[PDB]
Design an enzyme around this catalytic site. Structure first.
Site, short mmCIF file in Angstrom:
data_model
loop_
_atom_site.label_atom_id
_atom_site.label_comp_id
_atom_site.label_asym_id
_atom_site.label_seq_id
_atom_site.Cartn_x
_atom_site.Cartn_y
_atom_site.Cartn_z
N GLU A 122 15.62 12.41 42.14
CA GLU A 122 15.17 13.40 41.19
C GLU A 122 16.15 13.13 40.15
OE1 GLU A 122 14.06 17.40 42.18
OE2 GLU A 122 13.35 17.93 40.01
N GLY A 123 15.59 12.98 38.71
CA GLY A 123 16.46 13.54 37.42
C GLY A 123 16.02 14.51 36.78
N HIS A 124 16.75 14.76 35.52
CA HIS A 124 16.23 15.68 34.54
C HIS A 124 14.68 15.61 34.32
CE1 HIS A 124 16.79 18.69 31.75
NE2 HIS A 124 17.95 18.39 30.88
N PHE A 125 14.13 14.27 34.16
CA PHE A 125 12.89 14.26 33.44
C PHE A 125 11.64 13.50 34.25
CE2 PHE A 125 16.03 14.34 29.71
CZ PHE A 125 15.74 15.74 29.07
N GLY A 126 12.06 13.16 35.42
CA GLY A 126 11.18 12.21 36.52
C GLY A 126 11.82 12.02 37.74
N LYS A 127 11.14 11.43 38.58
CA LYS A 127 11.24 11.44 39.98
C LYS A 127 10.99 9.95 40.35
CE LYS A 127 9.98 14.98 41.77
NZ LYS A 127 10.27 16.37 42.04
N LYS A 168 7.70 5.70 40.54
CA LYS A 168 8.61 6.61 39.60
C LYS A 168 7.47 7.14 38.62
CE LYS A 168 12.26 5.09 37.84
NZ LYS A 168 13.31 4.79 37.23
N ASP A 224 23.84 2.05 34.48
CA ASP A 224 23.84 3.05 35.64
C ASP A 224 24.30 2.15 37.32
OD1 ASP A 224 23.57 5.63 36.34
OD2 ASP A 224 21.32 5.34 37.02
N1 LIG Z 1 17.61 2.25 43.65
C1 LIG Z 1 17.51 3.44 44.22
C2 LIG Z 1 17.65 4.73 44.47
C3 LIG Z 1 16.05 5.43 44.55
N2 LIG Z 1 15.31 4.56 45.57
C4 LIG Z 1 14.51 3.81 45.56
C5 LIG Z 1 13.88 3.50 46.86
C6 LIG Z 1 12.99 2.50 47.29
N3 LIG Z 1 12.55 1.58 46.41
O1 LIG Z 1 12.79 2.36 48.43
C7 LIG Z 1 14.69 4.30 47.58
N4 LIG Z 1 14.63 4.37 48.96
C8 LIG Z 1 15.17 5.38 50.05
O2 LIG Z 1 15.97 6.31 49.58
C9 LIG Z 1 14.75 5.14 51.23
C10 LIG Z 1 15.82 5.61 52.32
C11 LIG Z 1 14.36 6.29 52.17
N5 LIG Z 1 15.54 4.99 46.93
C12 LIG Z 1 16.30 6.88 44.75
C13 LIG Z 1 17.04 7.81 43.58
N6 LIG Z 1 16.42 7.32 42.47
C14 LIG Z 1 17.01 8.16 41.40
C15 LIG Z 1 16.25 8.17 40.28
C16 LIG Z 1 15.15 9.15 39.98
C17 LIG Z 1 14.52 9.27 38.72
C18 LIG Z 1 14.49 8.33 37.69
C19 LIG Z 1 13.80 8.21 36.63
C20 LIG Z 1 12.50 8.48 36.61
C21 LIG Z 1 11.51 8.60 35.62
C22 LIG Z 1 11.99 8.36 34.34
C23 LIG Z 1 13.51 7.78 34.09
C24 LIG Z 1 14.23 7.94 35.26
C25 LIG Z 1 15.74 7.27 37.97
O3 LIG Z 1 15.95 6.25 36.97
C26 LIG Z 1 16.56 7.45 39.08
C27 LIG Z 1 16.35 6.12 41.98
C28 LIG Z 1 15.55 5.29 43.28
#
Ligand SMILES: N#CCC1(n2cc(C(N)=O)c(NC(=O)C3CC3)n2)CCN(Cc2ccc(-c3ccccc3)c(O)c2)CC1
Length: 286
Positions: free
Chosen positions: A19-24, A44, A135
């Site tokens: 989860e971030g400020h604007f999305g998940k 996303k 990032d």
């Molecule tokens: N890389 C990575 C980490 C994340 N992740 C992807 C998978 C997967 N593909 O499987 C995964 N897998 C697990 O955790 C499994 C163990 C269970 N984790 C989890 C955290 N988020 C943070 C975040 C949230 C929102 C935005 C965002 C939304 C909208 C608009 C702009 C920005 C954003 O840029 C970044 C990024 C992806």
């Protein structure tokens, strides 16, 4: 039938991954047969909120990721239109931040240097396409298997204009400052060499198995003090100007620490490159 077209009526939300400020990012099951045999996917999407175009930026992120093809970059699967959702492969092992603390016994220094190489290959591939990631941290490096990692999030990724060396940033309140190079902190300018500095920080995380008490935040707040509120980032800049850096991780050999330190030259022009790092790691693995 378009296999990159996910119908909303079959995309069953399971839980939040991020989860971030604007999305998940959410774990979903795409289940067109309605019997729970469908594939798990990472999804996303924006919070209802929105604004100064979060939607335009997500649409750009979709077109960036759709057209990246690298074994160390997470796979685009499709979109869902309802407002738009980016559909990616799901990696059940999660990020290095989840995986390394649970698997220290099986991930040794050789495996750590292999992960380092693979992160540098994905980053060098992104740089070759004129992108800065902005990032790069262990929380955004996913574990495909014990032997393979992938860069897994592109939420801040920006195109560097042809004939320009950097991207100037405006929306910066949520910056991951303990991963950022001085030029980023001081002038909101983001170079490829700025991603090299973030890689060095991510390498330190990998070498500490992502332990929370060794995190770049915990260690820099110990150096500069944790009570400084709105003054934290200028104190961090001053510490870096004085030449203080994250210390050598426990059990990290000096020859690996010296590649890390080449990531953290104050001046971007003096920093190592991704292709130099790959050569350095490969010499150590030989
Ligand atoms: N890389 C990575 C980490 C994340 N992740 C992807 C998978 C997967 N593909 O499987 C995964 N897998 C697990 O955790 C499994 C163990 C269970 N984790 C989890 C955290 N988020 C943070 C975040 C949230 C929102 C935005 C965002 C939304 C909208 C608009 C702009 C920005 C954003 O840029 C970044 C990024 C992806």
């Amino acid at each position: 039938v378009d296999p990159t077209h996910f119908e909303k009526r079959f995309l069953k939300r399971i839980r939040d991954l991020g989860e971030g400020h604007f999305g998940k990012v959410e774990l979903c099951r795409y289940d067109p047969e309605g019997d729970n045999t469908g594939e798990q996917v990472a999804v996303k999407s924006l919070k209802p909120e929105s604004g100064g175009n979060h939607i335009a930026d997500l649409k750009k992120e979709i077109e960036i990721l759709r057209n990246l093809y690298h074994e160390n970059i997470v796979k685009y699967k499709g979109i869902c239109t309802e407002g738009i959702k980016l559909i990616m492969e799901f990696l059940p092992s999660g990020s290095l931040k989840e995986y390394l603390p649970k698997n220290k016994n099986k991930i040794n220094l050789k495996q750590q240097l292999k992960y380092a190489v693979q992160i540098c290959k994905g980053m060098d591939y992104l740089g070759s396409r004129q992108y800065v990631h902005r990032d790069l941290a262990a929380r955004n490096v996913l574990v495909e298997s014990e032997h393979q990692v992938k860069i897994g999030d592109f939420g801040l990724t920006k195109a560097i204009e042809t004939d320009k060396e950097y991207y100037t940033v405006k929306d910066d309140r949520d910056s991951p400052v303990f991963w950022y190079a001085p030029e980023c902190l001081m002038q909101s300018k983001f170079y490829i060499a700025s991603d090299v500095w973030s890689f060095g920080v991510t390498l330190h995380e990998l070498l500490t198995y992502c332990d929370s008490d060794s995190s770049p935040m915990a260690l820099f707040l110990k150096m500069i003090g944790p009570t400084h509120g709105q003054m934290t980032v200028t104190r961090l800049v001053n510490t870096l100007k004085e030449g203080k850096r994250l210390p050598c991780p426990p059990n990290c050999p000096d020859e690996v620490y010296q590649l890390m330190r080449k990531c953290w030259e104050f001046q971007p022009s003096n920093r190592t490159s991704f292709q130099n790092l790959i050569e350095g790691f490969e010499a150590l693995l030989k």
